């Protein structure tokens, strides 16, 4: 296969695995708690016990949770679980059938009929036959991932049936609820609620998880691929303002990465410094061309003396392919230093009130990639704010910053190649600052100035002011991807119907706009005739097209008048 695709696959899999690991870590606690609760019931009437999970407003993200809980409970050999999707429980019959069949299949899965004959009696008999004297009872768990989408009657009758059959069967059921328990209490009456005895369980919301994955993954120095501030902000925007879908973020990110690496073989260089050189060896003239064509290369071809070298670059590929291992080196090292600098500045800017420049590392990342930090008044304000605390607070603060960046350098840069370099470049500055702190009103501004010139100025540079060929590792071109992901068709239809970018329909649309809210067909036709047997047919088909699009509706509010639905 192509190299860029191989790098794409590798990167994507790494990232996905990382995110998956983070999610597993996030779920592990509540999971263990749930299992503990289930076995707790397994140990030691008339009422079935239940556990409510407050997974608010992201139903499709927390299926892996229940799946993991299934796997864990199966691993525990403590119980067998069936899951009932509100779509499979339109009626009570379908619910009980799906339940029994599910449990049977689950047992079949663990041990390693048809739905038409899945009665509760058959389940009870089956349970009695397989294991009634274990002696330690198993448990029948019944997961309801989508509590909000359930039918009240079916749910109540189901809960009543399950509650009735307790003692003889050890039933348990978990309630994956989006809204608070108010929905549970609102959906169920008291004579049904008096058979539940629930225990509320909480899971971290999507925002915290996003901050986590963002902080731990996209900002990790391990990955050579980076998102531009605008893209980063766009994803976090569409996440925080619309769907709280981690999945949607992951997929958008995936689309960005895919869209990025599909630029050509030239972007195969976006890898560890070691794996890139082979690709440099493997590159071809077209790749040299496309890496020549991109920005931040002309300024590099401009800033240079001895024009024979300039022509050597522009003409000879083999000579340009000798600069790559230095340019790439500089870029990777630069972004390494960049993250290492973020880790330090964020501790210094975050704690402050107002939070003008940023509070989280992602905010700084965006704000730094977008524009220069020194030019913006937020940074100046931050300095103005920093120069007032003084005393043990400031010292302790800068100390926390230094300790943090140090720990980060030891933990997150050591194992990485080019880590010796980054450490060798950054550590002495941290030492210098540490001394400048150990020296500590004037030495304060001295220390701040030192921090500014040693870190912020040279490391936390913007995207405009970035190493030669800062591309490949960074992905801009947010507009196209944005258009391809977001999907705002009505605007396209509007602009396509107003003035064709490339026309009876358009005229009919224009009149349709000119009208107001309700439209007599005759004068509409006459106007359309004023602008332009055959014509009538044209008009009819046009109106039918408008009807098909959904801009106009055939109303009966008046004799032969159409009502437009658009504004």
């Amino acid at each position: 296969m192509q190299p860029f695709y191989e790098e794409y696959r590798k990167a994507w899999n790494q990232i996905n695995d990382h995110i998956a690991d983070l999610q597993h870590r996030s779920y592990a606690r509540t999971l263990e708690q749930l299992v503990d609760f289930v076995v707790g019931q397994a140990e030691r009437d008339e009422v079935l016990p239940t556990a409510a999970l407050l997974t608010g407003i992201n139903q499709p993200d927390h299926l892996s949770q229940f799946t993991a809980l299934t796997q864990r409970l199966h691993a525990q050999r403590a119980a067998m679980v069936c899951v009932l999707q509100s779509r499979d429980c339109a009626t009570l019959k379908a619910a009980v059938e799906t339940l029994v069949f599910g449990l049977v299949e689950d047992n079949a899965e663990v041990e390693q009929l048809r739905r038409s004959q899945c009665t509760m009696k058959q389940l009870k008999s089956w349970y009695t036959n397989n294991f009634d004297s274990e002696q330690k009872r198993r448990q029948l768990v019944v997961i309801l991932p989508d509590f909000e989408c359930f039918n009240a009657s079916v749910l109540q009758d189901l809960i009543l049936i399950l509650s009735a059959h307790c003692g003889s069967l050890p039933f348990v059921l978990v309630l994956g609820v989006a809204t608070a328990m108010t929905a549970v209490h609102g959906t169920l009456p008291y004579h049904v609620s008096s058979k539940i005895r629930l225990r509320v369980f909480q899971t971290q919301a999507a925002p915290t998880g996003l901050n986590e994955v963002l902080d731990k993954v996209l900002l990790s120095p391990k990955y050579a691929f980076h998102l531009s501030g605008k893209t980063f902000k766009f994803l976090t925007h569409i996440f925080l303002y619309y769907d709280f879908s981690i999945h949607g973020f992951i997929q958008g990110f995936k689309y960005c990465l895919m869209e990025h690496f599909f630029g050509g073989n030239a972007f195969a260089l976006c890898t560890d410094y070691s794996k890139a050189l082979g690709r440099i060896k493997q590159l071809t003239h077209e790749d040299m061309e496309t890496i020549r064509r991109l920005p931040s290369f002309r300024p590099y071809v401009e800033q240079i003396n001895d024009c024979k070298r300039i022509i050597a670059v522009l003409t000879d590929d083999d000579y340009l392919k000798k600069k790559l291992p230095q340019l790439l080196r500089d870029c990777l090292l630069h972004f390494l230093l960049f993250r290492c600098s973020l880790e330090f500045l964020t501790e210094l800017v975050g704690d402050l009130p107002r939070c003008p420049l940023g509070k989280l590392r992602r905010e700084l990342y965006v704000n730094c990639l977008n524009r220069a930090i020194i030019s913006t008044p937020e940074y100046k304000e931050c300095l103005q704010m920093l120069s007032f605390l003084s005393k043990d607070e400031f010292v302790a603060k800068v100390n926390r910053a230094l300790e943090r960046t140090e720990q980060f350098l030891v933990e997150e840069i050591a194992p990485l190649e080019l880590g010796e370099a980054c450490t060798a470049v950054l550590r002495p500055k941290l030492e210098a600052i540490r001394l400048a702190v150990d020296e500590v009103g004037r030495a304060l501004q001295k220390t701040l100035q030192l921090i500014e010139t040693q870190i912020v100025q040279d490391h936390l540079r913007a995207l405009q002011d970035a190493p030669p060929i800062h591309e490949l590792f960074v992905f801009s071109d947010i507009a196209t991807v944005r258009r391809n992901i977001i999907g705002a068709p009505r605007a396209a239809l509007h602009t396509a119907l107003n003035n064709p970018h490339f026309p009876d329909l358009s005229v009919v649309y224009k009149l349709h706009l000119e009208c107001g809210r309700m439209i007599n067909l005759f004068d509409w036709l006459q106007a359309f005739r004023s602008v332009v047997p055959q014509i009538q047919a044209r008009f009819t088909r046009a109106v039918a097209e408008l009807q098909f699009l959904g801009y106009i509706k055939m109303s009966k509010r008046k004799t032969d008048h159409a009502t437009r639905l658009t504004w």
Binding site: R292, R293, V301, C307, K308, I310, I311, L314
Partner: peptide
Amino acid sequence: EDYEIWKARMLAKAQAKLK
């Protein structure tokens, strides 16, 4: 600005530098 025109321009500047 186009890439080929830029390349040609720098090439011309080089040919001018050689002179």
